[PDB]
Structure 1
């Protein structure tokens, strides 16, 4: 579990959520802009699953809900993540 505080775009591409094309899966980081704010933290990784955003659980969030929250936010944006662990995919 890692907790990150970012100030803004965040420079991440998020995927997953309730009702995703693969069913209800945790929100996750699918890509990251190489020079963006997320990259600059050196604490987020592609494949991280997002457990909380702006101090609230992602349990039950759809992809649209999570994206709208992140797009709308400014100031300090808290995120907590867990590593994907190569559990549901494999890094090559």
Structure 2
């Protein structure tokens, strides 16, 4: 598989179903690393259906936009405001599934 600490890109299509993602992190929200961790995933929502993204996975960028620094609300509203195919950048070292 990909190595731990591997930066990998996922293009998540919202083809199957609604996004059904939420995130946490930001300015030193609950999570210490402030990483934009996936907070919730709707069962068989786009992330879960795609199987690549799950809860606890950490996003850093969104279509080339460093989401780091931003608050958890922007992080959610960002996904919520993104389109069908979105380029998500994630780095390994995420929580278990």
| Structure that is richer in strand per residue | 1
Q: Give the SS at the match of 1:80.
A: strand
Q: Structure 2: any 5+ residue segments left out of the alignment?
A: 1-6
User: Which position in structure 1 is the counterpart of 2:72?
Assistant: 63
- Contact between 1:2 and 1:43, CA under 8 Å: does it hold in 2? no
SS in 1 for 2:27: strand
Q: CA RMSD in A?
A: 2.3
* TM-superposed deviation, 1:7: 2.6
TM-score by length of 1: 0.75
**Structure 1 residue runs without a partner (length 5+):** none
Aligned length in residues: 88
Seen in structure 2, the aligned counterparts of structure 1 residues 73 and 21 have a Cα distance that, compared at 3 Å, is same
Cross-structure match for 1:54: 63
The answer to whether 1:26 aligns with 2:35 is yes
